[PDB]
Amino acid sequence: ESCEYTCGSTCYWSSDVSAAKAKGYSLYESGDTIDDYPHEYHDYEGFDFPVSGTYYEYPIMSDYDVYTGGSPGADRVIFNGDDELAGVITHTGASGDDFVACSSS
Numbered sequence: 001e002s003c004e005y006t007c008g009s010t011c012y013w014s015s016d017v018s019a020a021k022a023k024g025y026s027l028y029e030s031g032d033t034i035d036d037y038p039h040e041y042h043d044y045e046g047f048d049f050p051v052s053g054t055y056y057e058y059p060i061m062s063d064y065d066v067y068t069g070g071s072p073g074a075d076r077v078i079f080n081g082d083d084e085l086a087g088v089i090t091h092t093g094a095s096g097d098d099f100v101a102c103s104s105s
C-alpha cells in the first residue's frame, strides 16, 4: 500500500496503476475506445520513459475506480502496445493540456 506514483497530492498504489493499465490495454488490444481513451500519446513533453514507444495514455482516477467513461481528470497511465508500463503523468502542476511527471513517493 505504498504510493507507486504520487500525482500532485494523489497517491496511487501499484494496484491502482496496474488496474488502470490493464483496462487501457484490453481496449487498445480490441481496437476500442471509451470516450477517446486509450489515446496515442506523442511524448511531446520529452519524458524519457523506460520502455519503448509508441505510447498510449488512459486515465487513472483519484477515486481509484477504473476509468469507464466520463471526465478523465488530470492523471494518465502511460503504456505501450506490449502492455508495459511507461509511467504515470499529470496535468496537475502543468500549464494547460501539458503534463508533468508524477513522482514516486
Ligand SMILES: Nc1ccn([C@@H]2O[C@H](COP(=O)(O)O[C@H]3[C@@H](F)[C@H](n4cnc5c(=O)[nH]c(N)nc54)O[C@@H]3CO)[C@@H](O)[C@H]2O)c(=O)n1
Residues within 6 Å of the ligand: 039, 040, 041, 042, 043, 044, 045, 057, 071, 072, 073, 074, 091, 092, 095, 096, 097, 098, 099
Ligand atoms: N489541467 C487540466 C487539463 C486537462 N484536463 C482534462 O484532460 C482531458 C483531456 O486531456 P488528455 O487526455 O491529455 O488529451 C491530450 C491527449 F489525448 C492528446 N495528446 C497526444 N499526444 C500528446 C502529447 O504528447 N502531449 C499532450 N500534452 N497531449 C497529447 O492531446 C490532448 C491534449 O491537447 C480533458 O477532459 C480535460 O478536462 C484536466 O483535468 N486538467
